[PDB]
Amino acid sequence: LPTAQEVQGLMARYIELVDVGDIEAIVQMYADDATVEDPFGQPPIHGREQIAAFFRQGLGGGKVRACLTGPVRASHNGCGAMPFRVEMVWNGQPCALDVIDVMRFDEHGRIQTMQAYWSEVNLSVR
Template sequence: MDAQLIRRRMARYVELVDAGDIDGILSLYADDAVIEDPVGAPPIVGIEAIARFYREGLGRAEASAQLTGPVRVASNGSGAMPFRVDLVWNGEPCSLHVIDVMEFDGNGRIRTMKAYWGELNMERRPE
């Protein structure tokens, strides 16, 4: 797996989250992908369930996103990245700091995604 391809795909994921482009996000995933968002939540399995997850979450939020550090790529076809999602949470503008870890298949599509975040990683933004 090409490290530069992984780096580009992961950065592209954040760009698509920022744009609210759910179809674009879904195109990055393998059909049998599994996500855990946040880690500890029940796994979401398969592209149809993943589509529901993004449409019901991101699709209903006015969110923006940006990388907050470089994408790190391992030699086994996986990578990790820190990023921030700005959104309205329980009626208040907040920033959520996330680290996503993704594994890619041989076609460069996301096979697994684990999002590391919790309420301790959320901060209120001034209105």
């Protein structure tokens, strides 16, 4: 499995691909066999058409920005969690959503599982 140092760099790059709004580059970082539980507690999303309809529904348009708000934590078993924020729109205006994702990386370096922790309690209108 990715080295912890490496799981870090796949996770900071991800915030990169999310932020520039490159949905296509976000959907190659995943596995055939992946789930998106986003937000965690919802069923999970799987299948490459499906997920890709997830990142398109959430980052299509451009107007979503996302940055790490502290360092990626990683393990030695190819996993890792990171804190970040997102600036987007809700109820017509500027909001922000605080987020931690946790990612499990398969033996090919692709997101085998991603889980995304947030809810309202992690929204601030601005």
